[PDB]
């Protein structure tokens, strides 16, 4: 129930703001005074501290937190050393931001609980949108299977779900349609799709992509 | 097989370049750092050392040829800004740019950036939902209220059937898939069973899902 | 009636001193303490502040000023970001100093009310004096027409305005003559011109330049 | 067709070089930065990379050939100073130098600079008159007391004649020109009309003009 | 005649390289500083300028050929760390690394360093025993309790025999050697004499030796 | 009885900790505040001071100490100048850490009492272990003679000291055997040696090395 | 009677110490706090001040001093600007240290009362000692004439002034002989010169140098 | 025609080099800065870019050939120190070195510098005597008590004879020379006259001269 966020960068700042917005106890820690002041209004508490300094860590009472997030990026040494201190303080859950393949590996070795690559991961998602302008967002069930949110084109305007027989034609299933903000869940065969609506389809990627090539 | 130009081979842009090329697209990698160009040389169609703030070098790249130009310059906001400005004045159709903060976004907005992205900001949200709720593995939002969520089944859910968990009536949700031992099951029948540490895909309203988590899981 | 001058450089310093000299309420703002102290005696109020910091801007009560001048030069990012903050604070009149063609463009895009290029503009004026040692100062009515202040040579000593029939000979009109500090406005045909006096002529540039080549 | 040397291709000196050359004069652009030389190469007769504090490189430029040498070095006051000192000792006829502050002016004065210029200081004054008085577009001072001013006509002045506005008797001033829609009118007759957002050129004493502004406009 | 690679030609690694080569071993000296490579060129089998954090340059060295690779990078802990990480992933049998502090040791421990060394830390102890006890010249610890010590004989011990100093019965220790004027004596007989400023080698328990020092010396 | 340690680096830090552990009066001196704070708990007293500043030296009352250790490394000039000040303050025993051959020489010239090369010296010791994996630790009696601690191999398991007739076969003598932590001093001819035990041998290096080649 | 020394470097420090030693009122001014503290005991007053800052100059009451010495070296701009401020404060006597030929020239132009080149001047003196090991010290009366202090060699031991008929042989005159510290002024013809004594000779340089070549 | 090596072409060493060469001596100028070497190239017999802390480059200079080596390195005390140390170990006969402070002198003293010089310190004294006493132009000290001084004659001394000013009896001093309008007079007769703004050379005890100044001048 107690969260600590060390390193109030673009990543950690988002985490801190979002966690706090959910009504959780969040401690924001940063070496820069300007940052601390900025996120003071976004954290339960905001304290200036050097996280590579063990005494300051104890001063924070950091052992009390079940989750501690190290979102230090540019200074790879600081990121590494901070996590190490935390593990030696027997912190249950330590999530750390990684800068490259090698940074992930050392964090792996020293007992980080979960390592994240925000930029590397988003890069993939956006690339998928670049290659395929139709795709708005998606989630991968596996290497082969995914759920995709498509932006309906002119070709689909005023067409029905039975008209788009994705179950037989593409082996897929329509999960939702979003029109002008209104949402429809598990839509009936009588439901109509208009242009520039959001269409949620489920199935194998190649089957979905094929629906895009032929259908959309 | 469109033509992409990627300016700024950082953690973000690097991923884009590697991923775009992997799909078999024509991608030009451009960076001011010579060491980077060598590194991503094996991942791009062409890799060229260039300063994107330099108009002559920009024309030398033949940037007019590209329908999509990606500005993935982060740390140097002025360079990020100045690059986009040149690109807009070169009448590039689609200019996608990485933003560092709220104000960087606004300036990119004003000078006519086509798509602005906040990788860290967006991931912060995604990760935060997992921090607050260890059960959620991944998700997608259909709207402000409705979302599709991938759940990690607990001991509490072991060996239970979909008809036993009538989420359609009890929680107004629907199970979309179950992933067991790597094997995947789509549109599972009411007789299908769920075991612990499997991946469970549920669809519905946020509050309805969270309630299922508190009571079911 | 309320003026704010941010960035007390060579440009802003001149503005601040000159505005204050006219008896206007001027707030001088600079990140450098030495500057603030220096222009303290030249401003109504002088306050140390980082203009890229939004809270300090509100602390200044900058919304209260009808005119805010951003005279930050070297740090182009600061100049840009400051103006942006001001526009988002709905400041009526925002005048900003530009460093180059590109800086003008972004300031243009983000809603600057007037953009100025002090060095670029003066460069032209001085170049005109370099090419033509006779010219002291001028103003352009258009691309073709201008009013010019000439330094009278030996060729013009003790000559009259009717003797210099600029209305017929060059299609121009003499507006003023300055002798030893004494000024003459709308001078009569009987007025005499002595060497090293200031002569103010009006007409087309080529006609004026021709008067210089032939007359002076 | 005199010979000009321009040392310091900054915002100021750059303008000078571009403008002088545009008039068809022989201009030599000299700068310590190689990137600058390339940039202004297209705007100068000759463009040479050189350190103006280096006497041998100075002679290599053949600076003795120039009747006018412009020192437009600003930020580096020592370089600005040291360049002028060399030039004076090379018996250059006319040495014009950019000054950064009051004291820089004094030293340039003492070592025999022929013309010292304060671009920002001078513009500050010009701009300030427009800030305090939005009606004034541009102006020139005949003396400490008398000036010629270009005014932006308001709604209050729309469709009024010059004889209706007898500024010669009422304010002791004279209208010199009216600019309408780009079209220009010189020495306008008393029957000539002025419409809003036109350019109005008035001549007289400062207080007389300002009074006309308060009452007329 | 094993194969050694020495990364980091510092005070520590430099000594290693010089000493290993002196014994007639194949040693490859590798350093990022070009000046260093030249300096230790005369002390290594091969001397190559290389960045040990660069994987391609690492393979170029043929580091796989070496059974022993010594990371003697100190000041730059990230480089020290990153080098070891690469080496472990290249499946190098024995990787010995210099540590700067306690935490640097831990990370080296976790990523599978085979031997970690603390030269300054270890010497600090050795030197400290001489500071506190000027009589001890050098020593070796058999355990936490038992050690072998080299003592500097005082005036108090001059011309005394080993049978006169029955350290075996009186202190439970044994004299192992006496060094006189450079001449060395091993397993000295009970009749052997000790003169001042000679080197005396004693073996036993720490407290027993120190007591002999207080009473004997 | 009074010790001063100037320069709390890796070397000096070890000295300070070890001297203090022995229950000696130790004054830790460092220019860095973080260091001083760190070794505050390891020194009798810890004081921030610049040792190149003579007044601060007198302020420490440094004349009172019989032993002063200068463990400044990176800044060779500071190391040199500090020692010089100390000698001019007539300090009895001044021990100084050296960085290179040349630093030793100047310290030699200005009257340092003992000069130490920690890294250079350890380099030799470790190299001996690299070349000979059997060697754990050693001490040199001279250029030729040494006492060596060997790690017993399979070849020596369950063998006796008379079986290893080092007195006749190699002209050496066994001094101790360490088994599972238990130690044996001046071991009897009946004593057994098991694998991975610690074996202490005394004699000429070549004789010992030969025992390793043939015996072990 | 009032002296100010700005810039407590090697040059200014010597001046300040030497002037103060003579019992004069000396104000030491330096931007570096450590310097100020150091020369505090050597000045009547020692004050931290930036001499390029006009207000601090007035704060010192620098107009009160008849002599102000600017001994700023490395920062040529500071040296120049300081002197300029002083001249504009109408300081009677302004002595300034110069770094090069060009620095002398600008100081010349802005009204420095005396400009000094300590290093350049000493360089000559020492060079004269290098070329001629016999010369200890000297003073030039002109380009041709000088007074020289010579170190007597073996060739001159136990020789008399009439024996060294410098008035006829070399056209010179002996002014003094220094033996073991004892000094002799206007020495008589009976005075003896012993080896390694100090001999003071007056005349033309070439005549003196010739005496060295032939006599000494 | 001895052989001189000059390390450190600063204000001090530069003067030495120029002056030594002017007298027609073989002088080798050595400096780490390439720009300096070019500058003093015209003033030295040979001018070579070299790092004096580099032993190999030092031998490359053939520094053993020189009987005199001048270390005129100031700012970088470690380089100044390290250079001298190398030179002493190369058994150079006479090593003259510039000192920056008291402690730099001591270290140079200890490592066997043959002559140590304090240009600024020495000049400070000379200049100070002129500051306190505007009448003195230049001087030389015979000892702690006795000195020879060059005085600037005032109005008070105009048209006075040497017999009128019997400094030999009245002040125990002697006039050595009078310089008038550039013309010089040595061993002037008692009938010789002194006019204002001439140069007057007086010899004697410091207090005797100063007293003559107070009373005579
Ligand atoms: N030693 C430290 N202790 C605590 N906080 C630190 C330390 N070093 C850096 N930080 C903080 O961590 C924050 C994030 O670091 P930084 O912004 O350099 O990483 P980044 O790669 O830019 O991350 P992002 O991708 O989120 O922008 C910074 O705000 C910084 O103040
Ligand atoms: N003017 C320029 N011209 C060309 N390339 C540039 C320019 N400025 C920066 N870059 C390149 O852009 C790349 C991305 O910038 P950088 O990685 O510093 O941003 P970042 O905030 O760290 O992004 P990420 O979050 O992906 O780490 C850099 O590798 C740099 O080489
Ligand atoms: N972030 C900031 N907030 C407020 N003031 C700033 C900031 N950054 C710089 N300034 C101030 O703006 C002033 C002008 O900037 P600067 O002098 O570098 O521009 P410049 O190009 O030299 O302008 P000029 O042409 O007038 O000399 C400086 O005095 C500086 O103190
Ligand atoms: N020693 C030198 N030799 C030759 N060129 C020089 C030297 N020093 C500076 N310059 C050049 O002078 C140019 C003008 O200087 P700079 O632009 O820094 O002055 P500024 O105050 O910024 O002027 P502006 O107000 O025009 O921006 C610089 O572009 C620089 O390349
Ligand atoms: N990335 C790298 N690749 C190759 N060599 C490196 C790298 N980083 C550092 N080195 C080299 O490692 C050497 C040793 O590092 P350094 O001497 O700074 O450590 P140290 O703590 O000073 O060790 P010592 O105690 O021996 O002085 C340096 O000489 C440097 O040239
Ligand atoms: N002028 C000074 N006065 C006092 N202490 C100083 C001074 N300069 C440096 N020190 C201290 O000396 C300590 C050791 O110096 P440093 O660590 O740079 O040497 P090192 O070569 O790294 O030594 P080691 O081999 O022990 O790591 C540092 O902690 C530093 O704070
Ligand atoms: N702006 C300033 N105002 C006052 N004092 C200053 C200023 N800048 C420098 N100084 C002082 O002037 C002193 C002399 O300057 P510096 O030592 O750099 O010249 P230098 O060439 O080394 O002179 P020297 O030949 O005597 O060693 C320094 O102690 C410094 O603190
Ligand atoms: N390691 C080195 N090898 C060769 N030359 C060097 C080295 N270090 C310094 N020098 C040269 O010595 C010269 C003199 O040093 P520097 O002029 O900085 O001393 P300084 O105190 O300024 O002397 P001065 O009082 O004459 O100005 C410098 O020009 C520099 O080029
Ligand atoms: Mg990032
Ligand atoms: Mg400017
Ligand atoms: Mg070390
Ligand atoms: Mg000097």
mmCIF file of C-alpha atoms in Angstrom, chain D residues 16-145:
data_model
loop_
_atom_site.group_PDB
_atom_site.id
_atom_site.type_symbol
_atom_site.label_atom_id
_atom_site.label_comp_id
_atom_site.label_asym_id
_atom_site.label_seq_id
_atom_site.Cartn_x
_atom_site.Cartn_y
_atom_site.Cartn_z
ATOM 1 C CA UNK D 16 26.077 44.813 -43.201
ATOM 2 C CA UNK D 17 27.817 42.290 -45.467
ATOM 3 C CA UNK D 18 24.585 41.134 -47.131
ATOM 4 C CA UNK D 19 23.355 44.698 -47.597
ATOM 5 C CA UNK D 20 26.649 46.172 -48.820
ATOM 6 C CA UNK D 21 27.113 43.402 -51.361
ATOM 7 C CA UNK D 22 23.509 43.757 -52.516
ATOM 8 C CA UNK D 23 24.335 47.350 -53.466
ATOM 9 C CA UNK D 24 27.218 46.033 -55.556
ATOM 10 C CA UNK D 25 30.230 46.824 -53.393
ATOM 11 C CA UNK D 26 33.458 44.859 -52.968
ATOM 12 C CA UNK D 27 33.097 43.238 -49.541
ATOM 13 C CA UNK D 28 35.494 40.823 -47.837
ATOM 14 C CA UNK D 29 33.891 38.657 -45.154
ATOM 15 C CA UNK D 30 36.267 37.463 -42.436
ATOM 16 C CA UNK D 31 35.395 35.207 -39.505
ATOM 17 C CA UNK D 32 37.099 32.814 -37.084
ATOM 18 C CA UNK D 33 34.237 30.327 -37.425
ATOM 19 C CA UNK D 34 34.511 28.101 -40.496
ATOM 20 C CA UNK D 35 30.760 27.428 -40.516
ATOM 21 C CA UNK D 36 30.044 31.175 -40.750
ATOM 22 C CA UNK D 37 32.372 31.678 -43.724
ATOM 23 C CA UNK D 38 30.436 29.002 -45.621
ATOM 24 C CA UNK D 39 27.118 30.614 -44.657
ATOM 25 C CA UNK D 40 28.033 34.128 -45.817
ATOM 26 C CA UNK D 41 30.101 32.824 -48.745
ATOM 27 C CA UNK D 42 27.096 33.385 -51.006
ATOM 28 C CA UNK D 43 26.730 36.974 -49.778
ATOM 29 C CA UNK D 44 30.327 38.228 -49.983
ATOM 30 C CA UNK D 45 32.773 38.953 -52.816
ATOM 31 C CA UNK D 46 35.338 36.845 -50.975
ATOM 32 C CA UNK D 47 34.920 34.774 -47.806
ATOM 33 C CA UNK D 48 37.983 33.793 -45.784
ATOM 34 C CA UNK D 49 38.452 31.932 -42.508
ATOM 35 C CA UNK D 50 40.759 34.044 -40.345
ATOM 36 C CA UNK D 51 41.573 35.091 -36.788
ATOM 37 C CA UNK D 52 41.542 38.888 -36.720
ATOM 38 C CA UNK D 53 43.716 38.930 -33.610
ATOM 39 C CA UNK D 54 46.458 37.224 -35.621
ATOM 40 C CA UNK D 55 48.695 39.829 -37.251
ATOM 41 C CA UNK D 56 50.162 37.481 -39.876
ATOM 42 C CA UNK D 57 46.721 36.263 -40.957
ATOM 43 C CA UNK D 58 45.680 39.920 -40.963
ATOM 44 C CA UNK D 59 48.433 40.835 -43.421
ATOM 45 C CA UNK D 60 47.550 37.688 -45.380
ATOM 46 C CA UNK D 61 44.079 39.147 -45.884
ATOM 47 C CA UNK D 62 45.732 42.212 -47.390
ATOM 48 C CA UNK D 63 43.762 44.417 -45.019
ATOM 49 C CA UNK D 64 45.866 47.417 -46.046
ATOM 50 C CA UNK D 65 43.970 47.422 -49.361
ATOM 51 C CA UNK D 66 40.694 48.359 -47.695
ATOM 52 C CA UNK D 67 39.641 51.955 -47.071
ATOM 53 C CA UNK D 68 36.888 50.721 -44.751
ATOM 54 C CA UNK D 69 37.266 47.909 -42.214
ATOM 55 C CA UNK D 70 34.272 46.932 -40.083
ATOM 56 C CA UNK D 71 34.857 45.264 -36.715
ATOM 57 C CA UNK D 72 31.569 43.572 -35.866
ATOM 58 C CA UNK D 73 32.920 41.439 -33.045
ATOM 59 C CA UNK D 74 30.602 41.734 -30.061
ATOM 60 C CA UNK D 75 30.681 39.015 -27.423
ATOM 61 C CA UNK D 76 34.465 38.724 -27.318
ATOM 62 C CA UNK D 77 35.321 42.285 -26.296
ATOM 63 C CA UNK D 78 39.049 41.556 -26.082
ATOM 64 C CA UNK D 79 39.040 40.294 -29.683
ATOM 65 C CA UNK D 80 36.960 43.300 -30.741
ATOM 66 C CA UNK D 81 39.419 45.563 -28.953
ATOM 67 C CA UNK D 82 42.548 43.744 -30.148
ATOM 68 C CA UNK D 83 41.356 43.725 -33.766
ATOM 69 C CA UNK D 84 40.746 47.495 -33.781
ATOM 70 C CA UNK D 85 44.158 48.090 -32.192
ATOM 71 C CA UNK D 86 45.902 46.170 -34.979
ATOM 72 C CA UNK D 87 43.856 47.997 -37.605
ATOM 73 C CA UNK D 88 44.756 51.425 -36.219
ATOM 74 C CA UNK D 89 48.428 50.416 -36.212
ATOM 75 C CA UNK D 90 48.064 49.295 -39.835
ATOM 76 C CA UNK D 91 46.969 52.864 -40.602
ATOM 77 C CA UNK D 92 43.543 51.888 -41.919
ATOM 78 C CA UNK D 93 41.664 55.079 -42.934
ATOM 79 C CA UNK D 94 38.191 54.311 -41.584
ATOM 80 C CA UNK D 95 37.645 51.721 -38.848
ATOM 81 C CA UNK D 96 34.032 51.199 -37.772
ATOM 82 C CA UNK D 97 33.464 49.045 -34.692
ATOM 83 C CA UNK D 98 30.478 47.563 -32.847
ATOM 84 C CA UNK D 99 30.339 48.330 -29.130
ATOM 85 C CA UNK D 100 28.805 46.172 -26.409
ATOM 86 C CA UNK D 101 28.684 48.684 -23.555
ATOM 87 C CA UNK D 102 29.666 52.174 -22.374
ATOM 88 C CA UNK D 103 33.183 51.185 -21.367
ATOM 89 C CA UNK D 104 33.867 49.227 -24.562
ATOM 90 C CA UNK D 105 32.992 52.445 -26.382
ATOM 91 C CA UNK D 106 35.505 54.440 -24.317
ATOM 92 C CA UNK D 107 38.412 52.109 -25.084
ATOM 93 C CA UNK D 108 37.491 52.101 -28.778
ATOM 94 C CA UNK D 109 37.353 55.891 -28.538
ATOM 95 C CA UNK D 110 40.817 56.113 -26.985
ATOM 96 C CA UNK D 111 42.549 53.821 -29.477
ATOM 97 C CA UNK D 112 41.240 55.851 -32.391
ATOM 98 C CA UNK D 113 38.102 54.178 -33.702
ATOM 99 C CA UNK D 114 36.543 56.295 -36.457
ATOM 100 C CA UNK D 115 32.926 55.296 -35.877
ATOM 101 C CA UNK D 116 31.427 53.444 -32.913
ATOM 102 C CA UNK D 117 27.944 51.939 -33.129
ATOM 103 C CA UNK D 118 25.394 50.749 -30.561
ATOM 104 C CA UNK D 119 22.781 48.772 -32.569
ATOM 105 C CA UNK D 120 20.771 47.435 -29.607
ATOM 106 C CA UNK D 121 20.983 50.681 -27.644
ATOM 107 C CA UNK D 122 19.782 52.694 -30.627
ATOM 108 C CA UNK D 123 16.966 50.277 -31.490
ATOM 109 C CA UNK D 124 15.856 50.179 -27.870
ATOM 110 C CA UNK D 125 15.011 53.866 -28.145
ATOM 111 C CA UNK D 126 13.216 53.491 -31.490
ATOM 112 C CA UNK D 127 11.160 50.529 -30.295
ATOM 113 C CA UNK D 128 10.363 52.191 -26.951
ATOM 114 C CA UNK D 129 8.662 55.117 -28.700
ATOM 115 C CA UNK D 130 6.361 52.589 -30.383
ATOM 116 C CA UNK D 131 5.698 50.729 -27.125
ATOM 117 C CA UNK D 132 4.715 53.909 -25.281
ATOM 118 C CA UNK D 133 2.925 55.186 -28.374
ATOM 119 C CA UNK D 134 1.371 52.452 -30.514
ATOM 120 C CA UNK D 135 0.452 55.046 -33.153
ATOM 121 C CA UNK D 136 4.030 55.723 -34.265
ATOM 122 C CA UNK D 137 5.356 53.325 -36.904
ATOM 123 C CA UNK D 138 8.801 54.800 -37.559
ATOM 124 C CA UNK D 139 10.629 58.109 -37.112
ATOM 125 C CA UNK D 140 13.746 60.231 -37.552
ATOM 126 C CA UNK D 141 15.085 62.933 -35.215
ATOM 127 C CA UNK D 142 16.255 66.214 -36.748
ATOM 128 C CA UNK D 143 17.458 67.340 -33.326
ATOM 129 C CA UNK D 144 16.746 66.920 -29.607
ATOM 130 C CA UNK D 145 13.452 68.811 -30.079
#
